Write an enzyme that holds these catalytic residues in place. Structure first.
Site, short mmCIF file in Angstrom:
data_model
loop_
_atom_site.label_atom_id
_atom_site.label_comp_id
_atom_site.label_asym_id
_atom_site.label_seq_id
_atom_site.Cartn_x
_atom_site.Cartn_y
_atom_site.Cartn_z
N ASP A 90 1.33 -1.28 0.06
CA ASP A 90 0.26 0.31 0.72
C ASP A 90 1.35 0.84 -0.05
OD1 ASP A 90 -2.05 1.87 0.07
OD2 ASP A 90 -2.55 1.09 2.40
N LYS A 92 0.86 3.63 -2.22
CA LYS A 92 0.24 5.08 -2.77
C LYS A 92 1.07 5.98 -3.61
CE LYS A 92 -3.95 5.16 0.40
NZ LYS A 92 -3.74 3.53 1.67
N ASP A 95 3.56 10.67 -7.59
CA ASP A 95 4.58 11.38 -8.04
C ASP A 95 4.57 11.68 -9.48
OD1 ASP A 95 7.17 13.36 -8.14
OD2 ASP A 95 7.55 12.13 -6.32
O1 LIG Z 1 5.40 18.22 -5.69
C1 LIG Z 1 5.08 17.53 -6.97
N1 LIG Z 1 4.70 18.23 -7.54
C2 LIG Z 1 4.71 18.13 -9.25
O2 LIG Z 1 4.21 19.16 -9.57
C3 LIG Z 1 5.87 17.37 -9.16
N2 LIG Z 1 7.19 17.91 -10.38
C4 LIG Z 1 8.42 16.99 -10.46
N3 LIG Z 1 7.91 17.25 -9.17
C5 LIG Z 1 9.26 16.36 -8.81
O3 LIG Z 1 10.27 17.35 -8.72
C6 LIG Z 1 11.72 16.78 -9.43
C7 LIG Z 1 11.50 17.60 -10.68
O4 LIG Z 1 12.28 17.04 -11.04
P1 LIG Z 1 13.10 17.28 -12.90
O5 LIG Z 1 13.43 18.62 -12.53
O6 LIG Z 1 14.50 16.40 -13.03
O7 LIG Z 1 11.80 17.15 -13.79
C8 LIG Z 1 11.25 14.96 -9.39
O8 LIG Z 1 12.13 14.94 -8.23
C9 LIG Z 1 9.72 15.13 -9.13
O9 LIG Z 1 9.35 13.92 -8.05
C10 LIG Z 1 6.82 17.10 -8.77
N4 LIG Z 1 6.24 17.20 -7.60
O1 LIG Z 2 -6.16 3.26 -0.95
C1 LIG Z 2 -6.73 3.43 0.36
N1 LIG Z 2 -8.30 4.77 -0.12
C2 LIG Z 2 -8.40 4.98 1.18
O2 LIG Z 2 -9.57 5.70 1.24
C3 LIG Z 2 -7.79 4.05 3.14
N2 LIG Z 2 -8.72 4.15 4.02
C4 LIG Z 2 -7.85 3.51 5.02
N3 LIG Z 2 -6.69 3.18 4.14
C5 LIG Z 2 -5.44 2.20 4.56
O3 LIG Z 2 -6.54 1.20 4.57
C6 LIG Z 2 -6.06 0.70 6.73
C7 LIG Z 2 -6.66 0.83 6.96
O4 LIG Z 2 -7.06 -0.02 8.39
P1 LIG Z 2 -8.09 0.53 9.47
O5 LIG Z 2 -9.15 -1.00 9.01
O6 LIG Z 2 -6.81 -0.21 10.44
O7 LIG Z 2 -8.80 1.93 9.25
C8 LIG Z 2 -4.65 1.44 6.78
O8 LIG Z 2 -3.35 0.71 6.25
C9 LIG Z 2 -4.76 3.10 6.03
O9 LIG Z 2 -3.05 3.63 5.35
C10 LIG Z 2 -6.62 3.40 3.19
N4 LIG Z 2 -6.34 3.62 1.80
#
Ligand SMILES: O=c1[nH]c(=O)c2[nH+]cn([C@@H]3O[C@H](COP(=O)(O)O)[C@@H](O)[C@H]3O)c2[nH]1
Ligand SMILES: O=c1[nH]c(=O)c2[nH+]cn([C@@H]3O[C@H](COP(=O)(O)O)[C@@H](O)[C@H]3O)c2[nH]1
Lengths: 257, 257
Positions: A90, A92, A95
């Site tokens: 999990d 998520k 980026d």
């Molecule tokens: O929070 C963010 N919102 C954004 O829209 C976004 N665009 C790029 N990145 C991150 O920034 C760095 C950019 O890398 P470059 O200059 O090599 O494309 C890399 O580390 C990317 O992971 C973002 N992070």
């Molecule tokens: O992708 C997700 N979308 C969701 O809406 C969501 N709600 C809970 N979580 C994750 O699932 C687990 C829930 O744990 P509990 O049963 O202890 O609340 C935990 O591991 C949480 O991180 C979510 N993950």
């Protein structure tokens, strides 16, 4: 008309990972995914072993394991194979594609090397899927798209949710389903997994809301319940897991007809 | 009439972390954040040392470091203090509050122990902020909220963006600003950091798109450019960083008038 998990596993467009999952669910009569939210490798593995017969999937947050090593994951895969469940990290991913590719394959965790399934938020646009798929396709992995969230004030509603479904349908080579609160796609090749599940009503202090297995599976049309604290916090984790399994399974059987 | 960084550092409602940042930006004449997208600790530390004088912040993806240890972070903190920049872990926390507090405090990374700043997606609702701040506030840390994204098909638009802004205003004790492509908040206490920046026009093949420092700082009104490959891929990363610093700084000066 609704097909069984067994029949959905044989659908022409079915992803191999989805197929494996759907078969073991039907064979084991479990549509329960355990959310193994523990901070020690020892407890993770003890739960995976004891509960593995009751579950179709073990969901991990390896970034909360105080004593993570790749060898812990090796041991986890052995349990996964022995007891027959999929491992879902999990993570998520959220980026840009260039970044998530590295976070999925590399670093300390090497998530792609042991996780059958991972998930991604869709907010960055489809580059998030494209990046993960460069790593996950050669390794025969699958991905779940976060279409809705269980938490209070979730922005994953309406058009955001429709975008998630569109993205999955257009990347079906790698995307096998959704994290959602309900059925979001009408295509039965896709899985729906629903967190935010307990037998009793309520929530937590930090935005999490709960619904019952009968509501989520029976009324809301989801496939698998994801359960953490409803099991982990219980005194008898095995009878808790059995309770959730029987709940989710019976709900599925009654929806099926 | 726009306030200089130095004046903003003294604003009544300024966060201590934002203040520290704004004062070193003023002092060193830099509004460049280096995105240190490397997989080896030695290259990370060599960049932080050589480029430290040219930057106000060093952004990390700790989960991409092949040889991460807490000792690497110790050495990075030393360089951070020596050269005066903040360390920003670009973790994009994006789970429910209960989970994100564990991901921030614990696991192998112990992000909160070394990261001045971290960031979060607003999709889960304000619970993601409440979770992080339970750990972050006691440690006098700050958080940036992702209000917009630079990538093709980003869903961080319209109401989603407005939601991020509201969420920041309502958690100003912890939230110091935004990742965004343009000014999103009228309140000068908030920082705007903008990734997707290069001196030349273009993009990558995984959805990233680029705009210049002059466009981003000068026209779109952001405070700080986040630059990865524009610097990292250059032969001389020090001269590259200087080019970006001078571009971003002069654009800032011309905006003040
Ligand atoms: O929070 C963010 N919102 C954004 O829209 C976004 N665009 C790029 N990145 C991150 O920034 C760095 C950019 O890398 P470059 O200059 O090599 O494309 C890399 O580390 C990317 O992971 C973002 N992070
Ligand atoms: O992708 C997700 N979308 C969701 O809406 C969501 N709600 C809970 N979580 C994750 O699932 C687990 C829930 O744990 P509990 O049963 O202890 O609340 C935990 O591991 C949480 O991180 C979510 N993950």
């Amino acid at each position: 008309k609704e097909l069984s998990f067994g029949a959905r596993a044989e659908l022409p467009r079915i992803h191999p990972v989805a197929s494996k999952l759907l078969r073991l669910m039907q064979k084991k009569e479990t549509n329960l995914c355990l959310s193994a939210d523990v901070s020690l490798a020892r407890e993770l593995l003890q739960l995976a072993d004891a509960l593995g017969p009751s579950i179709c999937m073990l969901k991990t947050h390896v970034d909360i394991l105080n004593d993570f090593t790749l060898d812990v994951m090796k041991e986890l895969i052995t349990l996964a194979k022995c007891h027959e469940f999929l491992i879902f990290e999990d993570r998520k991913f959220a980026d840009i594609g260039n970044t998530v590719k590295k976070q999925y394959e590399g670093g300390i965790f090497k998530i792609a090397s042991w996780a059958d399934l991972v998930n991604a938020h869709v907010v960055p646009g489809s580059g998030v899927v494209k990046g993960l798929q460069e790593v996950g396709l050669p390794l025969h992995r699958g991905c779940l798209l976060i279409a809705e969230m269980s938490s209070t004030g979730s922005l994953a509603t309406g058009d955001y949710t429709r975008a998630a479904v569109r993205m999955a349908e257009e990347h079906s080579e790698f995307v096998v389903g959704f994290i959602s609160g309900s059925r979001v796609s009408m295509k039965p090749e896709f899985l729906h997994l629903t967190p935010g599940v307990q037998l009793e009503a309520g929530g937590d202090n930090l935005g999490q809301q709960y619904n019952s297995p009968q509501e989520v599976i029976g009324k809301r049309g989801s496939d698998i319940i994801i359960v953490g604290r409803g099991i982990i916090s219980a005194a008898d984790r095995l009878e808790a897991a059995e309770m959730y399994r029987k709940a989710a399974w019976e709900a599925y059987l009654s929806r099926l007809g």
